[PDB]
Symmetry: D2
Subunit: 483 residues, 4 copies
Amino acid sequence: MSVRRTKIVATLGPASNSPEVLEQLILAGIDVARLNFSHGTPDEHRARARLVRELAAKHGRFVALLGDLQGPKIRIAKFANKRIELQVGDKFRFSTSHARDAGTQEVVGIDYPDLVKDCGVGDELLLDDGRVVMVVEEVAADELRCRVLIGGPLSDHKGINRRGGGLTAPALTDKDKADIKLAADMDLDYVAVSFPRDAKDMEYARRLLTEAGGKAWLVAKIERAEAVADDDALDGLIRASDAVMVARGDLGVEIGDAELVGIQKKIILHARRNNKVVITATQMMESMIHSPMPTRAEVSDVANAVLDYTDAVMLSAESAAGEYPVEAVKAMARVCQGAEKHPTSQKSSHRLGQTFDRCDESIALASMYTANHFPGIKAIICLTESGFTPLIMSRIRSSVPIYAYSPHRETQARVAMFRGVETIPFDPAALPAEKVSQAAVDELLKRGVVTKGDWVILTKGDSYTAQGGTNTMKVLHVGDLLV
Amino acid sequence: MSVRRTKIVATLGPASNSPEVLEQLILAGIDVARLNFSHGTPDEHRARARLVRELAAKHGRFVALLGDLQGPKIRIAKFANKRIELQVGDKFRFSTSHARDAGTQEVVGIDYPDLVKDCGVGDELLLDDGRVVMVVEEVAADELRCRVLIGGPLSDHKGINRRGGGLTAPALTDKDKADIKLAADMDLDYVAVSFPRDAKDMEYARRLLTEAGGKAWLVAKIERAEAVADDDALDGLIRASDAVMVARGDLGVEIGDAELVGIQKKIILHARRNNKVVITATQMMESMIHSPMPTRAEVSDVANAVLDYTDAVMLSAESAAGEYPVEAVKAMARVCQGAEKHPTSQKSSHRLGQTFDRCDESIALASMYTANHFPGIKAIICLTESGFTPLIMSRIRSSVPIYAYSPHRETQARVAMFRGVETIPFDPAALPAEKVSQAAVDELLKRGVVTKGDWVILTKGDSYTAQGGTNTMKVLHVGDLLV
Amino acid sequence: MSVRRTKIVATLGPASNSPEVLEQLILAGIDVARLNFSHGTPDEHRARARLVRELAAKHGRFVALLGDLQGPKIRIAKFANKRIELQVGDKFRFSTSHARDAGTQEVVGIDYPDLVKDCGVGDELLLDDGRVVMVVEEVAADELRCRVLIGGPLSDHKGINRRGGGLTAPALTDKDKADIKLAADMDLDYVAVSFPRDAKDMEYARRLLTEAGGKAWLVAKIERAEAVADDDALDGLIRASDAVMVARGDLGVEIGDAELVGIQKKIILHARRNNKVVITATQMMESMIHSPMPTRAEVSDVANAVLDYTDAVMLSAESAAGEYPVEAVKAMARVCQGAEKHPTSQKSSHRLGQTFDRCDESIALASMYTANHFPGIKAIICLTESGFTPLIMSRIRSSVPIYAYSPHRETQARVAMFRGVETIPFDPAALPAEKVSQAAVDELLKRGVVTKGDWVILTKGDSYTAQGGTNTMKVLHVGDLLV
Amino acid sequence: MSVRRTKIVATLGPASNSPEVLEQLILAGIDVARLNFSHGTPDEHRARARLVRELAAKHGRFVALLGDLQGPKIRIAKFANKRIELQVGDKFRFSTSHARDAGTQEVVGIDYPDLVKDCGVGDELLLDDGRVVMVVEEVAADELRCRVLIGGPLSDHKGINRRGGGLTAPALTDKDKADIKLAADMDLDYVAVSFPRDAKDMEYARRLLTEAGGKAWLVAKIERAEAVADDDALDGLIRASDAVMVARGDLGVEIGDAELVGIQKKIILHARRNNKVVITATQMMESMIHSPMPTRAEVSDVANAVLDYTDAVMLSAESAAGEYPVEAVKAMARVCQGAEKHPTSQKSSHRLGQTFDRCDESIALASMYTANHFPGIKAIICLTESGFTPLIMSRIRSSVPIYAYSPHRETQARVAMFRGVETIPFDPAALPAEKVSQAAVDELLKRGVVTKGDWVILTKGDSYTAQGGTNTMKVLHVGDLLV
Ligand SMILES: O=P(O)(O)OC[C@H]1O[C@H](O)[C@H](O)[C@@H](O)[C@@H]1O
Ligand SMILES: O=P(O)(O)OC[C@H]1O[C@H](O)[C@H](O)[C@@H](O)[C@@H]1O
Ligand SMILES: O=P(O)(O)OC[C@H]1O[C@H](O)[C@H](O)[C@@H](O)[C@@H]1O
Ligand SMILES: O=P(O)(O)OC[C@H]1O[C@H](O)[C@H](O)[C@@H](O)[C@@H]1O
Ligand SMILES: [Mg+2]
Ligand SMILES: [Mg+2]
């Protein structure tokens, strides 16, 4: 089998907090560790962040760190005895005037006044990611009086949303502003914004991140009905980001699970067309929380995401809280490898008939065209400062390995989420100009990726100091004297 | 929202044995009831068969009955209680001599004489489609003594295989020969053959079925590595059948779960190209055994099967043994409807450039072409004897309703598994020839499917008595005087 | 070789006026005789019209008659001596005020009052169908002072036009109004309008033709720069007609020879898209005026028109005035047959993805689809009243013979210009309804077009009296008992 | 309009022998002068060759010289009185036994032993390039007895051929071997072989040319039925050549005029696929022998050759013997420019799905891909030694100017026949390496082809001395500091 191209995002948590498990996850092949700021303390995150970077370096791997902002997720308050159980037909109330610590079998408090204002009789409310469902029977100034449609347990601080969406909330909370600073302070590679509705929400988050001196790239989580209402809404949000996440948990609540299949495919495609990275997420291997093997549906879900040409697939509870975090990563990685053998994973239309905007864009596209048609080419050596050039290369369907050669750590980590891209640390400026090409080829010969007789593509610009000036494509024969 | 086109196969069992639940399944929209002959007594099947047909007729629905032969897959015997639970590290024994009804927590019997010959110390055994895994620690003359590697439940007649591959029975079992007679005696609409390897296995089954006077159509279950080894193997097996099933449980064990995605798609496509019906099966909504809603992976799995253009999707334990059989069917039906709104579900290339063989094939194809391009057409009235004509129509991607008008019950049930086809009972021979067209159009006007001003396609042959002579296509305006 | 599908229009004149030559032209395969009203007396036309119809009937052929209106010719006045000769660089003047009777080597008069208003310095003037070319050097109050660009002879009443057009003239002259009546009186099948500018000119001609009781179909000659200025101009003119003619003589003068290739292709395509007939004309085999074989350029020109999917190709002086009218028709017919063997002549996209408007349109399209894919089909029996149904069929690329079965003479002749359509005289209303199918099939068996074992398509409507109700397509096996 | 891309080959002769006319032809835009060795003396050719090269240099143009070998004619013997005249309907005989000097009004001898074997009753025989045509009425053991179909004169040693071809003769005659030496001695850029049958004939010609020290590229004239008998025959002959010519005069005789259109298109396409140059020839503007303007058929013929994507179009008698050689070239050039504006002239599929063989091939293809999609690119600077790299570039449909930068005269002339390629004399080896790019860009700035702000593609290899090592593509912004 070939080296896996689709990247794996693994959420960390109680089940993946020790050095022994993190080491095993690194070895199993995680490419990105997600730190969910909805839970844990700042120091818990710092400790994990330090440990993943240490253990990655220990094994010559490049793992990005993604920080996930909680967002304006609306939660219930606490219960007196920490949890309750509800049956179909039971009556239940959400009250702004009920004490936050005194939840009972009949009522719980909520610290969000506009919840009651935005809801009306008939609205369906979904709690704990849809596990419990209620319908609003009566509205008063301070509470919603409901009937349970689908029973189950309820416990402190569980999430609530309305079927259809449309709830008022700010995109950035005060917690999120603090977490943005925390992310900048930890030098996180990616930061994910929850529940954005339009480009403004992402621009605001970008402002705050730069103001805090953060260099992270921004991920827009597509979880709101308004974000997918039409192509302009979606494309606007995508263009304001560096990456997007198909956040199927909250999105499914907002638009209905029966609409997910079409929207997942649209989001991935529109992301790639706008030269952004895309992640597919949520319940991809849920059964592995309690089982050491996935279901056939789970295998199919992941494989189909790979054929949709997602950059990465994500684990949440499977890796953060479940009994088999390492086995989940292993299984996910194996399914990705299998799906990548399909003929549709390697054949491209190469954006025929379209208009290119930039010069560096053109060299990237020209290289993918060349590599996909001259099969003697076994690798692409992309000398890059910020990772932009191999971002463009990896938007094109191919099975050729793309190597991002960079001296910077920021870049070496960034590309870990790019489908088909591997990092090779390399500093061309600190070498005699005439020796750069053979030096780059040496790095692949060391690793056994290419041998004498194979061909390779090298891309670069004129200087080795500025960014955004890729303008050259060379096709080199491994074995020849390379200038 | 439009009428669902993708068909639902629901396996019956303990959870779906009563008249109250079967009535609810019929109302929830099942199109085919599967009777798994691996479990239950002949009279249990007869009782369920009678009840489904009665309850379907009660609600003006046409539900086929599919009988699933156990096949030469090797199974364990019964337990004293029905089931046990095993933990990692537990010891367990498979014995040729142990009583077949007295299985315990420590040993179960097995009707496989070569057990000790085929297995050896170190071999891994897989039970229940890989869910439980054991390693052989000791071999004796009549038993295998094992340690559990992966725990889980075990129950009567669960499948067992060896990781190398050496468990199997040769060609059609004696049980199956008896069940073929039982199927013929019950007038089953479909019969499924397990573990077929090539056209010969299906021809043998067809011989036995016709010898017993059975009119059922044959379903080849694709579960053996040899059946998908190459296109000739697969196409041979498909051509010898009337329908095929993507049996992902056993198939995943035989070829590995990482290869399923590509093969599922190939099987569906090759089936449709050879004008056969295709079912996708196994663990599509497994979490609904214990939960009243599916996971996102399960939603995705089903939806993607619909976009692959499967005829039907299947439930096994979800409907047969689980806690929420009705909710599973409802959920599956809702996901199908959502996926059918996708633009790829309705647009066809119409087999351009290909060569047709038959005349009735040509009229079917010509009607789908016409309907897909003249949007005034709201339905296709296909007068058919055996259901062959609407079989061909439904191989072509479309969203136009196909109505199979037939006088025969055999046909009225058969087409229940055809994607996009609805039955309208109708006897053209018992009418004055000049009144047939308006009589057929009346049936759709009664049901509110078409109104005055809509157009319709009618297909038929010259006589109303023979089969295989469809040769006419008419385009009629609802409102006009129809000859 | 197969029966030629592309139709041949042959202009009559002095070289093709006798019964012996007309008989030879009929036998050589002409499908339409063009009567150019620019020359000849009314009785000369009547005599030829009668003779072609007589001789066609004598040999079981269906030849249409097309009457070509002269239109608005702008001409110079007379020269004092009979003819003058000009050399490149010579000076020459056109004067509104000079005496029209005697012209000199330096100046000629002209009956064009707007001359000085319409023309300007730099304009190129083309005389005698482009044979002489001049450029306007100076404009004075009553004359244009020119330099000769291309020399040659000039004589009394030669035509003059301006590169670009914009000379004022009505499309219908008083002569043309008289000729429209003459055409109606002769029962001409087609009438061609010269120099129309827009749909209004064609609607006016249609009014006059119906007022005179004429049943002819109208041909718009695309000869004016204004007619091809943009798609709306062209499409408007096409939609107002039944057929169009790529009139490359005058059109080349108006837009320049270097623009012809693109516009010829556009006109043909837009005509077919709007379900109109199209003729390609002018100098297709000019060398055959004086030679018994065509040049390779002439062969190429005709063949390329056939691959552009023109309905017909035309001869003008080659058949009307030249030394080898019969040999020209024979050569043209042979080149058509050769080009029709090309793979692009028989393969169609079948208007996939498009939206159909009418029901009879749908049956026509459905038949071409069916015939192009079921190769057992050797003919299409199209029962038609007015020829509309086979008009639509013949817009689709195919090599299957289309037979227009009609009782009417108007229709039997009309379809002679339709590519791939042959007339079979037939009256279904005068037969017992149940015997029609086999009666139609008999007509093809008589002619040896189909034999026992071949298949055929029959199209018709419900009654045999009304027009515009084709709604049925049947596929029949020649040899079976046909109802 | 833009600069013409399709190249013009003009045959020289009595009408184009003077310095005044040659100068006018150079200024009118000829790209290649053809020296037909069938006529003229060695010194007549030398004088013309010297004059075209002198006059081209005088006007900064690069005109190749093509030498056309006469090849094999089969000829009749002598007449008693040197010539006779034959009329339509006359009887005439060709006899293998009749005295070779005593030809009469009724019979002539012939030194063709297989005459009776090769010809048969019904065959048409063409003498003196088609001036006389006969049909064979009877065959006897030593003669063919014929009827004259087309009359004319006959004289000693006139050529004879059969419709259908198949007469035995070797591709290279003794005259041709002498002319190969003459071509080498004159340093001709191209040599054309007449009536080759297969790769062997072209390899033999290449041997003789190299043996004589000739550097010319070889043109295979496709005129023999055997050369187009199937794809292997044709492709074999193409692969053994550098260029091919669609020789429609002799080819039409050998396969029939009705087959030319399809074969012209096949030859052009197969030539381009195998990376060869292709010329379309013969009677493209024949009427211009005696007229100063072409017919519409001639305009169409040339334009359609341009849309078929021929590299060049040729004139023979139009430029060599006719009354208007300069006007013919001007007209041909104008028609080419018009046809090049068509949208199909600029859009390419870019050999999607295909497999490339070489590295320099890959850079050429990658540049055409890049140029066709980044419209900021206004030119391609191709540094080439032998012209191979811009040969490959020009196989791809585009409207971007391709500039072949070369120091060698051999190369500067060679590319004159390549569609869309212009020569820029340039010696990169004689410059400081760091100044090459801006030096090349200066050459285009001098000529006003590009301005500040435009982009350009530059291709090259590592050294500036070896051939066959193009391996680099750069995209440069005109105005920036170019390394
Ligand atoms: O745009 P980026 O990929 O960030 O890379 C940009 C840079 O990469 C190259 O290897 C060199 O460092 C520069 O020549 C170029 O400008
Ligand atoms: O649809 P099939 O099973 O091929 O049978 C086709 C039959 O359908 C109906 O009975 C039609 O009215 C008959 O004319 C035809 O023979
Ligand atoms: O082809 P059209 O001119 O529309 O006429 C179509 C007509 O042809 C059929 O043979 C019958 O005559 C009618 O059923 C029909 O109306
Ligand atoms: O296109 P070709 O004939 O192979 O010539 C291309 C060759 O010459 C040019 O000077 C290039 O700069 C060389 O580096 C290359 O090897
Ligand atoms: Mg099975
Ligand atoms: Mg020749």
